[PDB]
Every structure is written in structure tokens, then in C-alpha cells.
Amino acid sequence: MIELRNLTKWYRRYVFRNLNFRFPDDVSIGLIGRNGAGKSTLMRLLGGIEAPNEGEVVTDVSISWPVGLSGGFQGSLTARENVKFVCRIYGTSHEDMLRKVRFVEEFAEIGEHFDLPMKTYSSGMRSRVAFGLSMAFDFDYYLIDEAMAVGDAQFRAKSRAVFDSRVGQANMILVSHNMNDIKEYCDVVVLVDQGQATLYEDVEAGIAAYQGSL
Amino acid sequence: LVSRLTAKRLQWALVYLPMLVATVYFLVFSADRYVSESVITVRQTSASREDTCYLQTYIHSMGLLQKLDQQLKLREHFGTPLRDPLFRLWGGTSQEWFLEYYRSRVEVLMDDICGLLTVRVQGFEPEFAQALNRAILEESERFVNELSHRMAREQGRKLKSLVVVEPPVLPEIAEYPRRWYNLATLLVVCCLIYGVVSLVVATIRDHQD
Amino acid sequence: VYLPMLVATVYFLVFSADRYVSESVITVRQTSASREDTCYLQTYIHSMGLLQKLDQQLKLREHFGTPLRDPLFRLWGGTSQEWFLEYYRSRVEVLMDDICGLLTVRVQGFEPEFAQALNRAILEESERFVNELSHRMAREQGKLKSLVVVEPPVLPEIAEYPRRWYNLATLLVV
Amino acid sequence: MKLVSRLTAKRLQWALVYLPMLVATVYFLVFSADRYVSESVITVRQTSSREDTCYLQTYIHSMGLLQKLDQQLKLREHFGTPLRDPLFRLWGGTSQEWFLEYYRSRVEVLMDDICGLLTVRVQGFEPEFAQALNRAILEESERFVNELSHRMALKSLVVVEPPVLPEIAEYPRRWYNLATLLVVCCLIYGVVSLVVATIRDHQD
Amino acid sequence: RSPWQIQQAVLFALFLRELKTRLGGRWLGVFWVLLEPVAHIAVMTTLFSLAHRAAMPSIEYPVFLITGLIPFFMFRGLVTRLMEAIDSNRGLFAYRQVKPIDTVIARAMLEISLQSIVYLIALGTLGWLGFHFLPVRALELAGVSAVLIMLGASLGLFFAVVTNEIPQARAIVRISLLPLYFVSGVIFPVHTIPPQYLPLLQLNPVLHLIELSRASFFPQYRVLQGINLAYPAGFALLSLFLALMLYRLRRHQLA
Amino acid sequence: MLGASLGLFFAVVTNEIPQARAIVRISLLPLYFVSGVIFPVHTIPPQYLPLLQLN
């Protein structure tokens, strides 16, 4: 149950100021809105990157951090030390992080030059290991922001396959621009503009909202 | 528990209790300590800094303390204030602790550029402090004269004297118990400590998610 | 900010009492090593026996309490001996020039005549103390050290230390 | 590899904190022996210098003086009496060098440059013996100075503070040493635990 | 989970990460850390051995220099390595569990461990060669070291908060750390200084801490006027309070 | 000419190494004290004279 209580966050335009909102339970919801209108601040606060100055967000279930964050990796360290660092932050057990690093190195398929720092690292394998790490953790609200995979057709194909395998028992959150995948997975929509948010049960009203207000 | 600490509990444990304890001790249970100050210097009569160094060492010695205790009964006097347990000389203590207490009560400072030895004697009565300072000065002069006498006799009349720039003054009010200054500085330190502790515990609680 | 200035100005221009200063410049010399006697004298000026002698000579306690509208620089009645000594040390300033070995004594006071008399009494008592301190070592076996006056005590005409305008400007800095 | 995982940090804190403090507390509160200290403060002058005081400082810690004192007061027999103490007891049948080192450890000589006064602190297992040994040291020092002056071809020892008779022991300080060892053991355990965690993480 | 176990896990993770990046290659930085003090001891002994011999006839130059230098290396590291602890790990503040002060305290802990290890091995080596290696007042030395550590960490946190957007400020304080190495009496004993410059040097807390640590280390070491622990203790406490208040104010401004 | 030559040499050498610029900026400060700028140099013990002749 994700609930908002009079949130206020200064970024001197007040992006979000002492409003309250409610969210559906066990319903696929994807954040949508105009770029730069406050959606980025809202999903960063949803992922716990920053805390609200006033008000709180409450949820009885843990929230996964947004996927595909290249900034979350230290340049001087390789993928193995970074994944063991983040899992130690999450406090996993011994065999737990052994399984997690095995899964992430199997998903990466970058066994050659696997222990290579992010300084001399290509964007493709960086995105691969980022998606593998973001998938390796067990959660039920995935804050997917940019794409699903980087590579050839089979890369995105098996990424979507495992995504459907792991999401079918859970809930998934999309903040993107294309609406084909939103129509394919998502059911309800929240639109944010200038600090006011509107909830649409059907995305058909969201199409008209984008055509008119944006 | 650490997570169950509140602001008022922190204020009571850190600030209020030491404040009450210090105020009660200083304003009720603290004993006055009058100070008698004298300024002396030893010079030949018939290399003086050597004699000043000898006097500085000899004042804080044990034989002088033995003579002073036999003469003025310092141990009986210093144990008189019962209401002050911190600064009283408890009966039945050790000789080493008695020497440490006497060295704490009597302060000796030296001006090398001027070559002047100042002695500040603490006591629980002004008359006793002045008498102790006078006895210390007399014994120091007698010790210097005795050393000169035995040094002259070893080869086989007062030759060295101790000038007194300032005789022991009889105090009127207590000096060293500074209740208000100590209370103010302890209050400032306590407020700083409480602020630091509260900031640290808030930083720790910031990781609640 | 305006209220402290108002109260300070009214106190300085209405309540503050004038304090006249008399200046003397001395040094001690063997008639027939001088730094030692000079430092003994410098310690002796701010001593307590000298203050006692001055008290039963000139009655400084009554003189320093004669003002009534200047509680900041007033010697209140019934004050302690230690506070009286601190007040006397504040009122009498002793400076030393080592490269010349000269001692400057500045004596404050609410009346120029009393300030000059106090400075002269200090000088004569210092000379007598030097003579007696030599004479005790002299006759322990059983007039040789004279204090010369480079500048004798002067009789001031106007007050010096209550610098009202300078202190007001210094307060305006803060 | 296996050895680092063998500690589990519980046997680690037991072997780096519990055992040393337990052993030290047992030794200090059960087997440690009192050592009364007598203090004297002397200097040398001519009966009519600094170099002579330095010669005295060197002579006090010498072997001829130790032989004289062992012949006189029987220091070797006395220092072996506290059989309970294994550390600060002079064992029987030791060498001359060990006896000299032990005597130099018991007797402490200090000198300051400003005042030029030499202070001697003599330890013992009895206050009377410590005072007697200090007095004997002073007497032999003044005799040595006088003999040196005589054989050179008129000096005296100025005793500012004569030797005192101690009332209680001061040097076997139990609580201060226990607190110091507690701080040292805590720091060592923290450093070792951090290092062993780092190597355990790095090895696999 | 409890709000304290998260802090412990994050601190351990950041300590391991920063130790990994600090030691280049297969731990090559430890050789550098070990070669700074021996090089310093060599040059300064070669220069002022006779100077210290003429200074005081009670202390040999190696031990005096090492106990005046290793605490200053402690303080200099705690000042320098702490301001860069915020900008270097700026990207890590996206995992809902890493806060700006966590990297700061991790860097402080690792600096403490490294310099304490160096002090221990160097003292053991000096004792092995035949020099004095046992402090006469260990508890007072520990208290002085703790006060110096707290002051250094407080200054580092304060500078990291203040100069977050001003790298040139970090540059000028890195410049000014060098004169502090000469005005703290680290190399030469401070009693051979004309008294007219004495009060101006009484405003430096590091000099007070160095002198008090040397007094607690060496026997019968004379302490001149105005070397009380009250002034550096108050300096450290006030600086720590100011740094914590400034971090609490500028808390959400670190990305 | 000496200053310009040193500046050009350092600019060429430390093009990719800012830390080199940092350490030479550090070491410029002792050069300010070992060049005799503040105090006259003839009041210096002769044993340190040849070592300072290399500056």
C-alpha cells in the first residue's frame, strides 16, 4: 500500500507542495507525465533517492531502486566488487551473494574482461550488468525507467522473456515515452503536470490527456 | 533502547542531572578555601638561582611536610570540613596521599626573568593559611641557613638570607572555589555535548528506511 | 543596536566621572644589577603591604568612593580586601622599558591633586622599601641605593582616561 | 581460506579480549607483589659541580657500587623473597649481568638541566629495606666523591631531600595497568577483526 | 530491519570499497604509506641530529620525531582524505541506504586503522633496534590521541560540507596544511623559541596536542606555560558541533 | 627565461597528469623559503651553504 501524506519537496518553483494521493493495491501502475514537469522528482523520491522535506510515503512492502542507473557503479571498481558491495548493503548471506554474483555473471555473458573497472568499460556491457544486477534482487515493484536491454534482437527478446517470468507474480512500474509497452503491460495511469496529478483507470483517457494538455 | 530514546530523556540524562548535581554541590556542599599569597627571593648576604631552585624543590618535599604537620597539625585542620567530600583530607589515608594533598594545596610559581618565587597557600580559614605561609617561609630560610652552615662546617653565622618582597597576606574572602564560573562553563560544555549527541542520534535515525 | 548606543551615550555624557592621571618616570641605581632591584620594585608597586601603607597614609578607600553617579568606576562601600586590591591594581598602571630599564607609573584619580599625592607617596614608599630591603641584608650580619626621578609626578589639568568619543566609536565598530 | 572462517569473531574476541584481561586481572589481584619506593634528592657542592653530579649519576648505576651494596645489605637474597611473583622477582642462580640489569631497573636516577638536582627512587619489597638501600646509596656516593677528590691530588653531598620511609606500595599499579591493557586489547581486536574481514572477503 | 544494522552494513561496505580503491594494484599504496615516515626520519635526522643533541640531553631524535610526526600524519590524513569523500562517491547516493556522512566516517575509520597500524609497527621497530618504545602515561596518551582524532575528523567533515562546490577552497587548504606542519613544533622542540612569538603559537590546538602526547610518552618531559588540554578539547567539541550542524542544514543538497 | 622555460616544460610533461601540477604547486611553497626571499642569506651556517648553492 503506497500512500502519500502531504509531500513537499523544494528543488524557486515548488514542484510538489503538501498534496496527498492514494494508489491502487496489486494493480499494474506506471508513472507517466511530461518530461521535466516533476515526474523525475516523483520517481526518484519513490525509489528513495531523496526524502521529502514534508510528508511521507508509506508502503508495507519494500521498493526496488530504479533500474539502469550507470551512476550507481563506482568507476575504479569492476562489476564483481560493485555487485558484492550492493548486496552487502542489502545484507545478503554468503551463499546468497554467491548465487547473486553467479546469476549476474551468467546474465552478463562478459566473462572475458569481466573484472574490468567502469573507467575502461563500454556502454553495452555496462547496461547488461546493470540490468542483471537490477534483476538479481527479489522485489515486487520494479521501477523500470529506460528500455529493457541493450544489444541485438535476442538480447531484448530474452530480457523480455525473463522479465515476464519474474513480473507475472509481481507488479511492475514503467516510466517511459512509447505507449505500446504501456498498453501491453500497464493497466492504470497517473499523469503529473506542474505538481497536479490525475488518475485514469483506462489509458484511453490518457491518450486524450496527452493529445490535449501536452 | 537506542531507537527508543526521546529528546526529553536525552535532555534529562545529559543536561539537567549534572546541572542539579553541580549546583547542589557548589551552592550547599562546597567549602571555602582562603588563599594567602607571599613573594620571596633568596640572595647572599656576606648563584642565587641555585638557592631558589633548592627552595622550590624543598617546599614540596616530605621532611618539610613532616615539620609542618608536627608544628601546625595540618592533617587535623584539613579534615575539618565534613560537608565537602571532594576537597577534604579524609582521615586514616596514606602518607603518599597526604603529600599529594599538601602539594595540591600549596602552589609555588617561579619568575625566572625576575627570579621571584611566589607561594600561594590554601586553607579553610584565613588565619591558618597565613600561619602556614609564614611557617613555610621561616622553614625555608632556616633550611638555607642550615645548608650553608653544614657546607662551611664540612671544611672544618648567617651567610645567606631570604628577602621577602611580599609578606603573607591575610585573606578576607575565599578565592579558589569559583561556583559561578565553573557552573557557566559546565553549562556551556553540557549544552554542546547534548547538541552533538542529538545530531548524531538524528543522523543514525536517518537510516530508518 | 540603537538602545545600547542611547544608554552608553547618556551614561558617558551624564553619569561618567572624570579620572585624572599623573605620570612619573623612575629608575633605581647603585650609588657606590639594577634590573633586579627594578623588577623587585615593579612587583612591589602592585603588592598588598604597599596598598595598606597607602591606605593608612592617604585614605584611598574614601577617595575612590567619593563619586556617586558613576557606579562602573566606583569603589563601593563594604567591598572585600581582594576586590579593593584589584581596583587599586586597575587604577595604578606600571610599565617597564627593558632596553632603557625605566619604570613608568601612571596614577588615576578623580582629583588631580590626590593623584599627584598618590604618585609621590608611591615613589617615596618605593625608595624606602628598596633601602629597607638592602638594609635588612646589611644588618643580618650583625643609604646606598637611591631612586632617581627622570620625570617627577606631574599635576594634570584635564581628565585623560574617560575617553568618551573614542570608546563610543569603538562600540560603533562592534 | 578455512582458517579465517574458523574464528567466527566470537572465539576471536574471546582470544583477543577475554583471555588477556582474565590473565592480567588474576596476576595483578592474586600473584602481584607490593614494591615500596623510597625517594631522595641530592646534589654535590664544594665545601668552600654539575660534572660531579653527572659522575655520580653514572656511578650509581655501576657494578662496583652494586657489588658493595650486595656485600653490605644482601640485595640478591632480599629481591628473591616474593616467590608468588614470577615476573619482578630475582630468580636464584642468575648471572652478574642479569643482577646488574635488575638493580638498574629497581633504582631509578633522574636529573634536570635547569636545577641540576639529582633524584634517586629506590624500589623494594619492604619500606625499611628501600629506605636503608637509599641511605646506603647516598653514603657510598658521598664516599666515592670524597675519595675521588682525595686521590685526584674537599667536596660534600648536599641532601635537599633525605630518603623517606614509604607507607604503601605505589608502583605495582593494578587498575591503571588494567585499563591501559583494556584499551590496547580493544584497539588490537578491532584492527585485527577488520583486517580478517577484509582478507576473508578478498580471498574468495 | 533495525535502523542501526543498515548503518553498520553500509559502513562495512563503504570501508571495503574505499580500501579496495585506495590500495592500487595488489596493495601498492601500503609501501608508499610505509616509506613516507622513514624518508622523513632520514632527512630530518641527517639535518638536525646535532641540533637536537644541543637542544636537550634527555631524548634521542628518532623517537621524538616519530611521536611528533605520526600523530601529525594522522591529523593531516584525517583533514585531506575526508573532504574528497563526498564528491568522489557522488554516484553512490542512489541506493536508498548511502548518505553523505557514511562515506565520511568510513574514510575516517580507514585512516584511523592505517595510521594506527603504521604507528604500531614503527614503534615496534624502534623498540627492536634499541630505542625507547614504552610510554610512561598510556591513558593520557590515548586521551590526547582521541581528542586529536575527533578534531581532525570534525575539521574534515566541516570542510567537506563547506567546500562541496568550491574545489579551489580544497586547493588552498591543501596549500595551507604545509605551514601547519612547520608551526606545530613537529620537527624541532618548541621551547627554543623567543617568548614574543609564544602567545601567537598558543592559538594552535595541534601544537597543544602534540606537546601533551609527547609529555605523556616521554618521562619527566617538561611542559611550558599554556599547554592545557582544555583549549584543544573545547576547539574539537565546538568544531564537531559546527560541522554536524552544517551537515544537518545542508543535508539534501548532496545530489 | 628560466621561469618561462620551466613553465613550458611542466605544461608539456604534465599534460595528462593534473596530480603532477598539484605536487609542484605544493613544492613551490618551500622554494619561497629556501630562496632567501624573506631573510638575508649570509646569516646561515656554512654547512648548509653548498646545499643551497644548487638553487
Side-chain angles (χ1 to χ4, degrees), chain E residues 62-109:
Chain E
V63 59
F64 175 86
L65 224 65
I66 198 177
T67 88
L69 207 154
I70 304 291
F72 189 80
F73 270 13
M74 171 86 48
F75 175 72
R76 174 193 71 184
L78 274 188
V79 166
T80 279
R81 307 295 291 144
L82 270 293
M83 42 176 47
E84 326 305 19
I86 173 64
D87 73 336
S88 81
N89 322 51
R90 193 95 63 170
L92 285 166
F93 310 139
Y95 286 99
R96 207 202 320 264
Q97 282 137 321
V98 184
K99 308 307 201 302
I101 208 153
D102 298 318
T103 87
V104 162
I105 52 194
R107 289 260 267 235
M109 281 178 358

Side-chain angles (χ1 to χ4, degrees), chain B residues 7-177:
Chain B
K8 59 169 271 205
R9 300 161 91 81
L10 255 70
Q11 290 198 244
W12 269 107
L14 283 154
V15 194
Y16 292 161
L17 266 176
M19 266 316 107
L20 301 203
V21 161
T23 324
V24 162
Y25 170 77
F26 272 124
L27 302 197
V28 164
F29 285 111
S30 186
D32 287 307
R33 266 183 291 122
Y34 312 93
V35 191
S36 155
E37 182 188 6
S38 94
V39 169
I40 48 180
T41 291
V42 48
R43 296 163 109 196
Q44 82 284 29
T45 279
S46 284
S48 39
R49 204 61 54 96
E50 152 211 307
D51 313 288
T52 88
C53 293
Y54 296 180
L55 274 206
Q56 190 175 3
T57 280
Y58 169 71
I59 278 164
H60 277 178
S61 70
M62 175 83 220
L64 179 53
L65 178 54
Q66 274 186 290
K67 302 177 140 286
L68 289 180
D69 192 4
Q70 220 283 325
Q71 188 195 326
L72 293 147
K73 320 295 178 44
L74 318 186
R75 195 185 263 284
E76 279 73 76
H77 169 92
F78 281 126
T80 43
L82 260 305
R83 310 282 107 198
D84 186 17
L86 286 207
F87 291 103
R88 76 175 287 254
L89 184 69
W90 294 64
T93 36
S94 44
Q95 180 208 84
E96 275 64 48
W97 172 247
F98 184 34
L99 181 48
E100 182 67 48
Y101 191 87
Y102 159 78
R103 281 172 182 173
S104 266
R105 295 277 79 76
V106 165
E107 160 175 60
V108 178
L109 299 167
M110 165 94 95
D111 223 343
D112 45 356
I113 39 164
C114 297
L116 258 56
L117 204 70
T118 180
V119 183
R120 319 194 68 224
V121 159
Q122 296 185 39
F124 295 116
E125 304 279 4
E127 310 94 31
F128 187 81
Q130 203 211 19
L132 187 53
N133 207 325
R134 291 228 213 82
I136 285 179
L137 263 47
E138 181 153 347
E139 286 299 325
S140 294
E141 179 200 37
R142 185 199 319 280
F143 173 75
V144 155
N145 283 171
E146 166 76 27
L147 258 174
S148 193
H149 281 160
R150 54 171 51 201
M151 233 190 286
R153 188 192 333 117
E154 281 288 337
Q155 181 148 54
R157 202 222 94 81
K158 168 189 282 200
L159 191 130
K160 297 271 298 191
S161 171
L162 174 84
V163 317
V164 180
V165 185
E166 174 177 356
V169 53
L170 203 142
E172 182 160 337
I173 45 79
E175 162 173 322
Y176 262 113

Side-chain angles (χ1 to χ4, degrees), chain D residues 104-128:
Chain D
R104 289 188 177 152
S105 283
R106 303 275 77 74
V107 176
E108 178 186 4
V109 194
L110 300 135
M111 176 111 90
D112 64 356
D113 41 332
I114 321 91
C115 307
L117 274 89
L118 192 92
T119 171
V120 192
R121 326 178 66 221
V122 158
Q123 303 196 36
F125 300 108
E126 283 177 28
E128 313 92 12

Side-chain angles (χ1 to χ4, degrees), chain C residues 34-109:
Chain C
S34 55
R35 301 311 223 272
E36 302 278 329
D37 322 276
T38 292
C39 90
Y40 298 3
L41 223 43
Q42 161 153 45
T43 279
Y44 176 68
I45 303 279
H46 277 169
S47 82
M48 183 89 231
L50 187 49
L51 177 56
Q52 284 195 294
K53 290 213 186 103
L54 269 51
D55 207 323
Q56 322 91 66
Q57 203 204 300
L58 293 150
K59 314 170 174 344
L60 327 175
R61 255 205 181 277
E62 175 156 345
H63 173 267
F64 288 147
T66 49
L68 258 300
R69 321 276 91 187
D70 196 346
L72 257 283
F73 303 108
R74 188 173 98 90
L75 186 75
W76 292 66
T79 49
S80 88
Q81 183 193 276
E82 279 69 45
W83 168 251
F84 176 50
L85 176 59
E86 174 63 36
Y87 188 84
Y88 158 82
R89 289 194 178 137
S90 165
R91 293 280 84 79
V92 169
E93 168 160 39
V94 172
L95 300 133
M96 165 93 177
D97 204 8
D98 310 288
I99 86 187
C100 329
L102 279 154
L103 203 76
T104 315
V105 191
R106 321 196 69 214
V107 167
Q108 296 193 36

Side-chain angles (χ1 to χ4, degrees), chain E residues 1 38 46 87 182 185 198 228 230:
Chain E
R1 221 144 80 213
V38 278
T46 278
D87 73 336
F182 296 101
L198 261 282
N228 44 17

Side-chain angles (χ1 to χ4, degrees), chain E residues 175-188:
Chain E
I175 294 308
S176 60
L177 276 195
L178 259 279
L180 196 55
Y181 164 100
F182 296 101
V183 306
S184 311
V186 159
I187 314 149
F188 205 89

